[PDB]
Every structure is written in structure tokens, then in C-alpha cells.
């Protein structure tokens, strides 16, 4: 049998679980984050003789030497300390070397990267890692856009950081046909580098759309309890027992839903923004989840400027 | 203490009607059929169990046939509105004191509750049940909301546990019983309330549902138009839905029943009305679903006036 | 020949300007409000000898009596405290009377107000009075439902209040039949009782409709200057000479770009009734449902997703 | 100042004619070329006698306004590669000094673009978003302008000519204190450097599509109140030009898009937005009635459709 070394740059609740998960199957990683508390603790968090730190980024382009090419998957604050740190490994790394970038940044920026590598020789992949803290436990939901050769060069990492075919059905039609069979294992090649953080971005408008919808029903049902109903037109309704009663062979059965069960049972903000871009790039109406990453993304000036217009137009000026 | 199966009339005899019937008789119970059509009521009963599904001609032979058991129940699933207005008022002129009489149609609650009290003059009790699982139900089991008295909600107990899912394989919520909580909920049925309350769960459960669906399309409509000719090969990518659908069921936040339908699909109605006006009765907010509303509404109207007005503003009359 | 007399219920910053026009235009006015400073303030703002105080109803109702019918104006809070004044007048009012409420009353209150008291004999309007603080010197603009004998009848009193066809151009073509030529003056008849209420509620949306059109115009343009864009891309606007050139002849330019270059150089959820009427016709209405949701916003629904969120990414 | 100014005029139209008239009504000479010659001889038929000028190639015009301290040459051209092609052309024949206005619909970012590269040439640009359309030839234009603060003080006298003046509107309370630019009173203003001006334009009609939707879909609440969709008991048949017209006397929605409905109304009873819905994401500022102004002009084949195929399948399933 054969393994893989992978170093991780941003030991967060998403890198730190990777990198353990990737040492308990096997593989080989050279972590490193800002904070060295962090680094020690996924240090000590993974399987023995698996796991080394790295002080630097230097230092990691050091521990990946090989015969192999050196992977580096990153996992950093999306925005400036991103693009600082896969400038930085372009400077590091070699030809045959890859880049991975776990984090929420924009894909444009993964194909301008692509774009800016290629010239280097150092191939790009972008992976839109969906699961949180179960992905440790559950496996992560990946969709990633690189190059075929560097996809099928990176597939190990990969099958060891999917799910699997798990506890899933198979949905009937998926056979004989020209589909991607690793979809069914929880992470997909999805295009070009690019492709694979916008998938995520739409899933995580998605999301957001029925995190919303959830919101206002079980609003709804809340409010159905309110004193501005007479009392006979209440009904004082179990929260928790819908949420739980709703899991089982209803419509509106989810992950989501068991979340908000869960929950239940215990008591920056235009980040959708992209998505919306991309819906007006392409002339695509989305109303849903325009309304529901707007309930969220508000203005505080463009809110007391229609407040202070309208209590001019009803009480004056003085 | 209940070790037997009780015996059931059904009015109104469609693909869940008789889907109810054949899944009470599979479960050991008897029922009492009949439907407008003869053909269907003797076609199910002939998808019955032999010997427990006996046809009725009229419903005054359904309520001669019903007659020894301590309660007759008779469920009736027909269209909502003046049908099923006219078959519950039949049964209340035809069914006595003790007799149970269950509403499984998508009625607005407030005829619920209003039965609900006609019926009680006449002694009668009057239950609602919403029922969630489409033609899936039968093999599956049904997600049942139900309103009514405690009594008669413990009497019509081995019915709906029965009819339900169960317990399943799906996994427990963490935190539900040291509370104290409704048990039977962990089953796929549930006691919401009065009467009227078991469909009005439901109805806010079908907007939800109308919600999280509009998301999903809205979202495989984006992923979709990225490889539309209205952009620039430059910024294209040819994404598969069927793959993006897949890996979306292996541990991602969008994992839902509806994005099972949804990658079955690519692999191959009222109550958001009433939804809305309950959140406006409320006073509550609901955006997405008021969202996924207005899609369904389409006026050219509209927007040929504010057309008008521009080539108007631009072009002038005279 | 003659002048009218009106009761004014609700002496606020809308009703005691009216009460005061109307003294100004030579009719009698009859005021009282829950505070009694303010009613013997609104007396005396009025001209000298026209308006008298009330302090009850009753008493209104005794110095509202005569031969012609009396008009009450109610002004009140909308919601209970309307609903209690309007279902005492029907019973201290006789056959005849009229019974106006400005208020900003849900229309389909004001029909059934209207079926309520036409058994009594008393005539029921709805007006929706528009201007606020400023149509005390410039006139209110007024939507009102009624009767048509009563739409006549109190037809004095509301062309006191209106602006008049003043200096506001005619619209070309508004000489043909089926137009109702006081509309050129302020005030229309728009039909039965609570028709004026509704179109006061649609007008209300589309105000907020365009103001936050204007705020979100404002918005991308003061943030063209923010530090989170390229020193390169970024734009130093002046946000009170764009409102101030804005109203010379643009497309833009209304009434609320005017209040809105008087504030930049000075410097709960209503709007969902409108939205029940755009459900109960079919309508589309996604501007005015975003406007309104811009101002209409649940605790509980925000901090339930953020929850949920938060639920996802850490547990 | 105590005279009138020529300027050459690109794209006659009927903005850029127009344009071109109601220069020449207010003293100014223009030089006008289109590329139909028949449009080109008819503007300047419809100009004061001895003001208008007709020009047949650009190189022509660019001889008929020499002599001059700046040749000012206003082009409105149908926006995109047309427009372009023109200015570069014009870049290309006039020299150091001279000043080229651009009146059309251009990208600001294009502006900001071409006055970057003119300036190398010495040729100052500026931009010109001009509001008003056809009304503005006899109401005014109301022009957001961008450009070099001496080529603004320079070409003064013809934005003054063409702005719709102090009037008879009302003056804000609280404009004579300083800092205010005065001229902002008169109907135009230079709101910053070129490409600044086309970007109020453009935040401009995007708040015109917004206050233009909204009324559509008030007036359309308004006239299916009176829908066969509702009972009998629950209708209104209200008359929609009566309350646009009453809505004219002092209400809050008094506004000249409500003049217009009012007008458009006795006789039966567009790409900027996109842009600043663009430049509202580049800013991280929240737009919802405009986005959602935008996507009522937008058409979903499939988003509809498909969540009814997928509620079809939940409730009734695949047969095959």
C-alpha cells in the first residue's frame, strides 16, 4: 500500500479535523498555523509519527520535499491572507506541485490563481469543503475544479477526506450512464479550477434558502401562540415535537431540520452576495435566495436614511 | 393495553386514500372502503389483504358495517372544499354519539375547527390529520400532523402508529427524552393540538417545503446557465447537475428528501397561500416564502406598464 | 352662501391642522381630544370665534346639532382605539350623520363599519389624508369612500382641506367622460366605503417603494468612496449637490428627492396589508415586498437561522 | 463671461439634434455631423439661422472648429463600439487643449478609461450623463457631469445653456450656507473626475427603474381589486387615472414618473440598472428593490418549472 503527504496551511475546526482525519487514514501531514498553540495541539491530536509541524512556510516547502509532488492545502481567512499565502507558495513550490484552497474565496480569484500558476508550472485546485465539525466523523461533502491529471493524481487525499458511499441510498438512474461515480462518494470533479468553489457558493445560497424558510415557518408556528390573536384563533404549539415529527417521511425532512431539532431540544454578512452576481451574470432570476441572504445583509445607513426621510415627511423638520 | 387491530372507514379512495387503506390492512387492520367510482373501491379492495377490506355501496352502508366496534371511524380523504364539506356533514347526519370522524385532506384549519365544534354539538368527535409522503407513504410510511381531543387521540393511537413511519433507522436527536418530551413525535406522528392545529403544521410544513424547493431551483437554474451562450467562453464552465446533485447527498449542508427527488429527477399549490396570510395574521415576516409565492404569481402586466412608462419617459407621446 | 360644521375627533398633528384649515376657510369646527391642553391648544390656533372645544362626545354631539347632518371626523390611533370612538358615535349619532375616519384604519374595517352603521342610518366615509405636517398651508391630498349623496354633501368641507387645481400643470387629455374632475383639485371619490383606505394603503406602499430606491441609490453612491474598494476605482460624491441636481428636470425627481435634498444639506410592519391584497389578486409585488422587508423584521427569525449557522459550523 | 460658444456635435439623433437645437436657441454655435447626411442637413434646418454649421467627415468639423482657444466636440452615439471607434478617431484628429464631451450611455469604467488615455494626447474628457430624453429640449436637461475642473469651468457656458435653469422650483431650505456647489441649483453638476458623472447617471436610472416598478405594481394592486379572481362582495372598480391624477396634488408619491403614468394613462386604462446592481456588489451595499426591479426584467425558463416538476414527482413519483 501506498501514502500521501499533504502539508496544511490554517488549522481551524476545518483544517485541524482534515489534517487528523488524513492521519488516521494513513497519509502523511506537515501542519502549520499562525498560533503554534494550534499547531501542537493537531500535532498531538494525530495518529503517531503522522503528523510534524512546521514553523514557517518555508519550513513546510522543506518537509514535503520528494520524490512525489508536494501537495499544500489551504485553509485560511478568505480575502487578503489567502491570496498573500498562495502567492507565497507559488514562490515556494515547484513544477510539479500543487495548491489546494479549502477556503470560501472567490472563484474568480481561483481562476485568475489557476491562470497566474500554470505559468509557474504549479497546478491549482479550488475544493468547496462542505460538513463543518462532523466531516472529522462523517466525512466531507467536496466539489473541487483543478486539472484531470492533478485530480486523478490527488484522488487518494480525496477518497480518504469523502464520506464514502456511507449510509446513503443510491438514487435509481445513476447506472451504466456518463456520470462521475465518485460523486456517489461524497467529492466531485467538477470542472476547471473555479468551478469547484462556485459549486459551494450556490450550495451555500442554497442553504441559506432553506435556512430561511425554516426560520419563517417555525416563526410562523411560534407566533400562532401571540397575543395579537384572540385566544380563540391560538394554538400553543410544541416547537421541538414538529421539528422531531417532521424528520420522519415528511417533505421537508433535512440535515438542516435535524440541526434545528437539536436545537430545539436545548432551549461578514453579504457573503451571498457573489452568488447573486453570478445570478445576474446570467440573467437568472432567484428571488428566494435574494430575499434570504437579504434578510440578512442590511445597511445601517440605508435604513435611517429612509427612517430620517419619512419622519420628515410625517413630522417635519426641527 | 392494546394487542389487537381495529377496523376503519375510508371515504375517498385515490392513490392515498387507497394507499391508506392498503397500507392499514398490510399493518393488520381492517377497513371499510368506499369511493364515488365502484370500480376503484372494489380495485382497492382487491389490493388488500384477503379478508380485511370489505367494500361499501353508500355511506350509510359504511356506517351499518362499522357498527360493534366501541367507536366508528371513518377517515375521509376527499377534495378539499364543498366534497368534503358535504361527506362530513353525511357523516355527522349518519354517524352516532361515540363515532370518530377524520379529516386527512388538505382543509383549511379554520373549517377544521369549525367542524370541529358543529360536530361536538352532535357529540361526535372530530379529528384532522395532515398527512405528508405522497405516493412514498405507502412503502415508507406517513408523516402525520393530527389535531383533536386526548381521548380520542389515544383511542385512533394504533391507526396512526400504524400509518406512521416509526422509529426507523433514522437516529435519535440528541437531548429529546431527559426533558420529557412527546415520545410518539419520534415516530413520525403527532398530537399538535385542538382540532384544526394538525393541518395547519402541515400547511406550514407544504410552505416550507414550497420554499426550499424554490431555493433548489433557483440554484440548479444558476449552476445550469454558468455554460449559457449569454456569456463569454472565457467565463463558462459545463457543469453536470446530475454529479453536483449526488455529491450534494454525501454529508452537505443541502442534503434533504427534496434534494434526493431532485437527483432522481436530473438523473432521469394553496397552502403557501394560506401560509402567508397565517404569517400575516401574525404579523410576522416571510420573506422566502412570500418569495417563492410570488413566483408562482406571474402578471405581464406588470411589467409591460413600467415598459410603457419608460418608452413613454425616453421616447415621449407628442 | 354657506359654511359647514364638522366635529374633529383626534386633535394630533394631523387633526388639529385640519381643524384649523377649515376654521381658515370660514367653516365651524367642533374639537376635542383625550388631553384636554391640547384641545384648548388647538383652540385659539384656529380663527378667532370659529372653532369651539368639546370635552366629552356627548358634548360634541349636543354642539354638532341642527338641521343639516353631523359630520364627525375621527382621527384617532388606529386599531381599538378607532374602532371604540367610531362604535360610539353610532350610537350618539341619529340618522343621517356622517362618520369620517382619517385614520390610517384597515379598509376592510372600514366596509365592515360602513354595513354596521348604514343599519343605524349613519353614513360612514374613509379617507386617507396625505401631506402630514405640510398640507396645513399646501392642502392634503385626500382618498375617500362613501355614498355618493354623502360624497356631495361633505364635498364643502374636503375642498377646504384640498390643494385646489393650483400650480401644478394639467395633465394633457382630461377632458372626457368618465373622469372625476375634483381629482385635479386633491380630493377623489374613489368608490364605496373603504375604497378610499385601500388606495391610501397602495399609495402608502408605493412611497416606500421609492424611498428605498432612493436609499439604496444613495447608498452605492456614498460607499463608492469606502476603503474597502481600490483608491483607483473609488469616487468622492457629494451626496446633497446629486439630490439638489437631481430635481431639475431628471426622471428622478418627486416629492420625496425634495424632503430628501432638504435633510442631506440639513445633516413597524403596516406595509403588509398592501402585500395581503398583491396575494388576494394574484399580483406580483416583489419591489414593494422588498422595500417592506427592508423595515419588517423578526428577532426570532434571525436569530433562529444565525443559531442554525452557528449549529452547522461549530456545533 | 458676455458671449456664446461652438461646439461640434456627433450623433444627431433625437437627443443629439435636439441637443443641437436647443444649444442654438441659447446663442451657441454648433458644428453637427451624422452619418445619414439627410439627418445631418435637417438638424441643421431645425437650428437658428447661421448657428448651426453642417459637417460631412469628422476630419471636416475638426477644421470648422479651429481658430478656436478649445475645439469642444460632443458625441452621442449609440453606446458600445460605435462610441468608442468615434472618441478614439477624435483622439486621434484633435490636439492638445481640445475637449471631448461624451453624452451617451457609456460604462463609467470605459470613461475613466479613455479620459486616462486622452490625457496623454493633452486632450481633456469629460462625461455627461444627460437626463430629460426628449423633454429635456424644451424643460432643460439635467446633466451629471465629470471631468477636470478647468475643462468644467470651461465648457460652463454651454452646460448652463443646456441645464434647465433655477425655475420656478422651489429652493431647498438650508442651500445658502457654504461648501454646496451652486450650479447643482441650476440643473447640471460636475460631480468629480471623468467617468464620475456617467456613474450618477447610472445610479440615477436605477432609482428610476425602482420608483418605476413600483408604481407599475401599485397600479396593478389597484386595478385587480376589481378581478374576476375575487367575489363579488370583495371588489373595488377604482378608476386608475383618477388617482394618479390625485395623487399629483401633494401626496407623497407626487413625482414626475407619476406625471408620466397620469399622461400615459388618459390614452388607455435600459441596461444602467444592471450596472448599479453591479457596482452595489463591488460596494458590499444591500439593493434589494433594485435587485429586485432587475429580476422582474429577467426571464426564468427553468426556475419555475423545475420545482413544479419536482413537486409532480413528490407527489406522484416516477413511472418511467
Not at 183 to 210: D, R, T, W
Not at 253 to 257: G, K, N
Given at each position: 500500500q501506498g501514502h500521501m503527504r499533504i502539508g496544511i496551511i490554517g488549522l481551524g475546526r476545518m483544517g485541524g479535523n482534515i489534517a487528523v482525519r488524513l492521519t488516521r487514514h494513513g497519509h502523511d501531514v506537515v501542519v502549520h498555523d499562525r498560533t503554534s498553540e494550534v499547531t501542537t495541539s493537531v500535532v498531538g491530536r494525530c495518529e503517531a509519527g503522522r503528523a510534524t509541524p512546521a514553523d514557517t512556510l518555508a519550513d513546510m516547502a522543506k518537509l514535503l520535499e520528494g520524490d512525489e509532488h508536494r501537495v499544500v492545502w489551504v485553509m485560511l481567512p478568505a480575502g487578503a491572507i489567502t491570496e498573500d499565502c498562495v502567492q507565497q507558495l507559488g514562490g515556494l513550490l515547484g513544477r510539479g506541485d500543487i495548491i489546494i484552497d479549502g477556503g470560501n474565496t472567490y472563484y474568480k480569484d481561483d481562476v485568475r490563481r489557476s491562470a497566474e500558476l500554470a505559468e509557474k508550472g504549479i497546478s491549482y485546485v479550488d475544493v468547496g469543503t462542505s460538513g463543518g465539525v462532523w466531516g472529522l466523523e462523517r466525512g466531507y461533502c467536496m466539489m473541487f475544479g483543478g486539472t484531470k491529471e492533478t485530480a486523478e493524481y490527488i484522488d487518494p487525499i480525496l477518497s480518504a477526506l469523502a464520506p464514502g458511499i456511507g449510509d446513503v441510498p443510491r438514487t435509481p438512474g445513476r447506472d451504466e450512464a456518463g456520470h462521475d461515480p465518485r460523486?456517489?462518494?461524497?467529492?466531485?470533479?467538477?470542472?476547471?479550477?473555479?468551478?469547484?468553489?462556485?459549486?459551494?457558493?450556490?450550495?451555500?445560497?442554497?442553504?441559506?434558502?432553506?435556512?430561511?424558510?425554516?426560520?419563517?415557518?417555525?416563526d410562523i408556528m411560534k407566533s400562532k401562540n401571540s397575543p395579537i390573536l384572540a385566544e380563540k384563533d391560538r394554538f400553543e404549539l410544541n416547537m421541538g415535537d414538529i421539528a422531531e415529527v417532521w424528520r420522519r417521511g415528511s417533505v421537508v425532512?433535512?440535515?438542516?431540520?435535524d440541526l434545528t431539532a437539536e436545537a430545539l431540544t436545548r432551549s461578514d454578512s453579504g457573503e451571498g452576495r457573489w452568488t447573486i452576481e453570478a445570478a445576474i451574470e446570467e440573467d437568472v432570476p432567484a428571488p428566494v435566495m435574494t430575499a434570504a441572504l437579504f434578510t440578512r445583509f442590511r445597511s445601517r445607513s440605508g435604513n435611517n436614511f429612509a427612517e430620517k426621510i419619512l419622519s420628515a415627511q410625517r413630522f417635519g423638520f426641527g
Open positions: 460523486a456517489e462518494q461524497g467529492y466531485l470533479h467538477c470542472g476547471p479550477a473555479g468551478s469547484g468553489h462556485f459549486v459551494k457558493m450556490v450550495h451555500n445560497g442554497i442553504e441559506y434558502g432553506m435556512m430561511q424558510a425554516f426560520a419563517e415557518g417555525f425532512s433535512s440535515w438542516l431540520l
